[PDB]
User: What shape does this take?
Amino acid sequence: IDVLLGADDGSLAFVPSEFSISPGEKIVFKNNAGFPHNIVFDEDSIPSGVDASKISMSEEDLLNAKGETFEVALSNKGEYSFYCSPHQGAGMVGKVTVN
Assistant: This one.
């Protein structure tokens, strides 16, 4: 599934922000608008036993250019909360469910 970072009107959102995938389905996060952006999984808000480091950007890492992507595949089932660190307070947050 593709997810935009920034809406086409410049809104600081993931599009989509809430979505479900199957195990080992790839997510491609694509820099769209209002970058730089990143994708961080909340270590307190992912399935038990998952290593956030394996699936997230560092807080300090950025995608700086239009069309840069970060791709990830999730295998454990459950709910995963993520956010964009520089824009978290703006509400640039999301949740994926692996079912």
The CA atoms of residues 22 and 91 lie 26 Å apart. The radius of gyration is 12 Å. The longest strand covers residues 26-31. Strands lie at 2-5, 14-15, 18-21, 26-31, 40-41, 69-73, 78-83, 93-98.
